[PDB]
Design a protein around this ligand. Structure first.
Ligand SMILES: CN[C@@H]1[C@H](O)[C@H](NC)[C@H]2O[C@@]3(O)C(=O)C[C@@H](C)O[C@H]3O[C@@H]2[C@H]1O
Lengths: 157, 205, 129, 79, 82, 123
RNA sequence: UAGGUGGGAUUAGCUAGUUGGUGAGGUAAGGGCUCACCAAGGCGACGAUCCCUAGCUGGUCUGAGAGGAUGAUCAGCCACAC
RNA sequence: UUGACGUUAGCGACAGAAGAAGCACCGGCUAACUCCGUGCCAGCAGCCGCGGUAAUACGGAGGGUGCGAGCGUUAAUCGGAAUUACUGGGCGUAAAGCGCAUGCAGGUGGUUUGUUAAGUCAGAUGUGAAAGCCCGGGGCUCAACCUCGGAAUAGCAUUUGAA
């Protein structure tokens, strides 16, 4: 499987005695639409090579997230650098109500119904890190019951 | 208003068939369907998420021949209604009389269907309805007035609709020229080419 | 001055769990012990014990699972500087129902679940998740 | 018998206690509970009460421009 | 005086009357004491033409409420309905 | 800020300002041109930009831009002004509504005509 | 009667029928409502006084909400009629 | 005998595609690109900017996009703005710790028994106009609209409990 999205391309510069070496950063996200998601950030002097590098990096850095059949089990907060993300489970039909970067991550991860907001910096590179920080923080009701030595019933009763 | 202008052009933009002609000739034989309209038609590339969403919304509007103000109201109802906003929107579009006289086969297109409806050809439960956008309910009986039972366009369109797959939520006696909207279609019943999700997303954006 | 012993209890637990401490001791009190009892019931601590008669100390044994601390969140809600009382229909859900909120009702100190089932509101002490 | 308790906060008027009634209210915005105070000139026929006393007053007919409360009962006299 | 009278609501050309107890001095469509029923002069299908709480009508008449001629006829109609 | 601080002094609403103070919250305003001149943009930009000093009905004197190629505005012309900064021209906060009162449509415009007051070409 | 209902502290004191008492008058009716007399009270940092703005409400608009903005039409209340 | 509306709605019958499409935009944001004219001029512009010779930014044209009996502009409110942050922000260096302290009012306050029940919580009763909003219906060919029932009115008063 592995759906791969390109969140951002950006032209960066190193100043040099000559003039300016201009290069390209690519922020990509990969996942299986069913719990795995990874990001990759690649650099190169050509755009295709950056995307390629990012994709390769992404594949290696993928991570399980506990989803509730296309939504979250509970609300989560993420933070990275100055980017803060809130995401909340939603009813089916809602769609991914996330903003930029955050929606790419949620697409490939397999979230179809979520409510989001991104506070603070909306810098793609940081949002993506916050989003996957948050998706990492999610636990299934079973996991939460396992940890508290109770049953899914008793947790919710 | 109703969009009165060239039909296949729309299909070319949307990059698909919207069934805006009767399927007696293949859309590809009547137009360069794989090129968009105009002088930059053979130059397609990156569309934005916004553009992607926009297109999907327009795909569905243009299929059913609804303008934006109406379409946006449908979305608002689909939202208000209980359950899946995406599905509700499709069942709202599928419940329209101009669509329902097309699904039954009285009209060869959804635009002929609409003329039939406007021109007072159609009864619903034996009363004359000439509002395209009327919401045919479950177990309603859409029929053709005895006056119009002799229109050869109708007879034509029935055999055109034989060439398509049957709606399993509509029953039609084309001999008596009456149909029953048995029930509202499910999401499964309709095209899975439609990504309703994107249209919901467009109307949050 | 220390003007919120409950928050001090929670801090001590939160910092203990962070430092991978086995147990945490603090000056005991009724409400501290009551909280500790609920946290045991809900499976967030291992156990507690109140030693001493003159100046009683409380010892919460902390709980780890897969070498992560069981308590993720331990946020105090009703501070001294801003008390928080919710009616039964307005009780906070924590971690989408998977965490507790310790309510103090007039029939004792209970989770938000048990408070809702009891149709009691009360003072919101903290969120445990 | 909807009375209200309070504390005498002036007594210098003849036959009149100013009584400070104290309500504890949640703040509309910020959520904090907050002492707020109604002063309410009551009528004291006998000049019983003294600055500091805790009295129970009851609403009555207007007895002056500012007095439409009356002393029911002194609850706790001052030190 | 207190009167039981029709208060026109509805739309242009489609009058729908609330039967109200009111001080006579008010505008017919303004301050009323109690709504005791309604009268749809052009009711179709399942829509009721006349609801009127006769108990409340009698209550008010017994307190010296007048009835308008129209409400007086609808009271008869609500009694031939009873 | 602490709650008790906010209870003592609540968070202050922010006084916003209109960029079009002369309009006095009206969609347009009539004025009489007192001077119809040209001015040079702020630099990076280079042009001769057609403007009018206008005395409005509310007694404000303001400078309005006169947009589109060519105009018929002398001193004493009665014009309608709307809001609209010209970024290049420091001072100019209003546009002269073309095609309204004494101001005429831009001659021989054929796209965006409504914005310039020109009627539809008789085809 | 109580609570609620704009802005300004580069507006901090304000009040002397003023605040309360007694009696008389007066009113449909309690009441400084008025007068005489006695006392010196009353209000105010939980913002009196002053200044600016403003009819109030049901609602309306916006907002995930909490809020923010607003008070045409309709209905209630108030005020006014060169 | 009583209809202002009134030549009423609603129905039929005729005849014929017959009588009926604009407006903004197409440099990025933002859906839609080319060619000519122009040459820091003329002009554009919400923001970033565009124009000094191959201008997808100016003007026209062709083509396209959006919307449609409208479409644009201006004004105005909220939103986005977590950019006054209660929900929901900050203050080493970005704006922000009073130079330091003492201290009244205020805010807050250790442990514990009992009591009280002001705060808190639960319930009852009264009230919270009607309309509106929302949910189910009902009636207009549909819709707007009208309308029935409910929910709501997060409050307040009285009252009974919990502690
Ligand atoms: C003195 N010779 C210099 C010296 O080799 C410089 N490197 C330290 C070298 O640096 C270059 O290679 C650069 O990259 C910069 C450029 C301006 O000059 C180039 O040529 C530079 C040579 O001219």
């Amino acid at each position: 499987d592995l759906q791969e999205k390109l969140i951002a391309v950006n032209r960066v510069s190193k100043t040099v005695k000559g003039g300016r070496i201009m290069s390209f950063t690519a922020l990509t996200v990969v996942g299986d639409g069913n719990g795995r998601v990874g990001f990759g950030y690649g650099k190169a002097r050509e755009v295709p090579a950056a995307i390629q590098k990012a994709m390769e990096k992404a594949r290696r850095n993928m991570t399980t997230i506990a989803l509730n059949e296309g939504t979250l089990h509970h609300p989560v907060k993420g933070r990275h650098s100055g980017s803060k993300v809130y995401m909340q489970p939603a009813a089916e039909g809602t769609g991914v109500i996330a903003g930029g970067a955050m929606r790419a991550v949620l697409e490939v991860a397999g979230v179809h119904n979520v409510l989001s907001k991104a506070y603070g910096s909306t810098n793609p590179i940081n949002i993506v890190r916050a989003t996957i920080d948050a998706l990492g923080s999610m636990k299934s009701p079973e996991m939460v019951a396992a940890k508290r030595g109770l049953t899914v019933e008793s947790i919710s009763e | 208003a109703r969009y009165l202008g060239p039909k296949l052009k729309l299909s070319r933009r949307e990059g698909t068939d919207l069934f805006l002609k009767s399927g007696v000739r293949a859309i590809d034989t009547k137009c360069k369907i794989d090129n968009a309209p105009g002088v930059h038609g053979a130059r397609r590339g990156r569309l934005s998420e916004y553009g992607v969403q926009l297109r999907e919304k327009q795909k569905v509007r243009r299929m059913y021949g609804v303008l934006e103000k109406q379409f946006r109201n449908y979305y608002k109802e689909a939202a208000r209604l209980k359950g899946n906003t995406g599905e509700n929107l499709l069942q709202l579009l599928e419940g329209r009389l101009d669509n329902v006289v097309y699904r039954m086969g009285f009209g060869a297109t959804r635009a002929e269907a609409r003329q039939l409806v406007s021109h007072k050809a159609i009864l619903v439960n034996g009363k004359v309805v000439n509002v395209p956008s009327f919401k045919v309910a479950a177990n309603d009986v859409v029929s053709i007035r005895e006056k119009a039972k002799q229109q050869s366009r109708i007879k034509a369109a029935l055999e055109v609709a034989e060439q398509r797959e049957k709606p399993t939520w509509i029953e039609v006696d084309g001999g008596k020229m009456e149909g029953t909207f048995k029930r509202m279609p499910e999401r499964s019943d309709l095209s899975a080419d439609i990504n309703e999700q994107l249209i919901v997303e467009l109307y949050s954006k | 001055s220390m003007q919120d012993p409950i928050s001090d209890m929670l801090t001590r637990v939160r910092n203990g769990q962070a430092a991978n401490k086995v147990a945490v001791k603090m000056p005991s009190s009724k409400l501290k012990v009551a909280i500790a009892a609920l946290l045991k019931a809900e499976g967030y601590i291992v156990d507690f014990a109140v030693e001493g008669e003159a100046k009683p100390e409380l010892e919460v044994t902390l709980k780890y699972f897969q070498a992560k601390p069981v308590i993720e969140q331990l946020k105090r809600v009703s501070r001294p500087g801003l008390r928080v009382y919710k009616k039964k229909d307005q009780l906070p859900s924590v971690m989408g129902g998977l965490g507790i909120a310790i309510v103090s009702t007039s029939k004792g100190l209970m989770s938000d679940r048990a408070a809702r089932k009891a149709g009691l509101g009360g003072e919101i002490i903290c969120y445990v998740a | 018998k909807r009375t209200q308790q309070g504390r005498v906060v002036s007594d210098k008027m003849d036959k009149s206690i100013t009584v400070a009634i104290e309500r504890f209210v949640k703040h509309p915005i910020y959520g904090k509970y907050v002492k707020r105070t109604t002063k309410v000139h009551a009528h004291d026929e006998n000049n019983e009460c003294g600055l500091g006393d805790t009295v129970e007053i009851a609403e009555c007919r207007p007895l002056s421009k500012t007095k439409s409360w009356t002393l029911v009962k002194v609850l706790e006299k001052a030190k | 005086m207190v009167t039981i009278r029709l208060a026109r609501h509805g739309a242009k050309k489609r009058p729908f009357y609330q039967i109200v107890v009111a001080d006579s001095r008010n505008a017919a469509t303004g301050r009323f004491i109690e709504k005791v029923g309604f009268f749809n002069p052009t009711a179709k299908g399942q829509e009721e033409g006349l609801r009127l709480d006769l108990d409340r009508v009698n209550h008010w008449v017994g307190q010296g409420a007048s009835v308008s001629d129209r409400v007086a006829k609808l009271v008869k109609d609500a009694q031939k309905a009873a | 800020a602490t709650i008790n601080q906010l209870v003592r002094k609540p968070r202050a609403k922010q006084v916003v300002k209109s960029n079009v103070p002369a309009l006095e919250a009206c969609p347009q305003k009539r004025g009489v041109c007192t001077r119809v001149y040209t001015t040079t943009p702020k630099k990076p930009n280079s042009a001769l930009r057609k403007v009018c000093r206008v005395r409005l009905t509310n007694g404000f004197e303001v400078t309005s831009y006169i947009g589109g190629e060519g105009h018929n505005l002398q001193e004493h012309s009665v014009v309608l002004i709307r809001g609209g900064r010209v970024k290049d021209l420091p001072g100019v906060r209003y546009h002269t509504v073309r095609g309204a009162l004494d101001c005429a449509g831009v001659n021989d415009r054929k796209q965006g005509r409504s914005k310039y007051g020109v009627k539809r070409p008789k085809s």
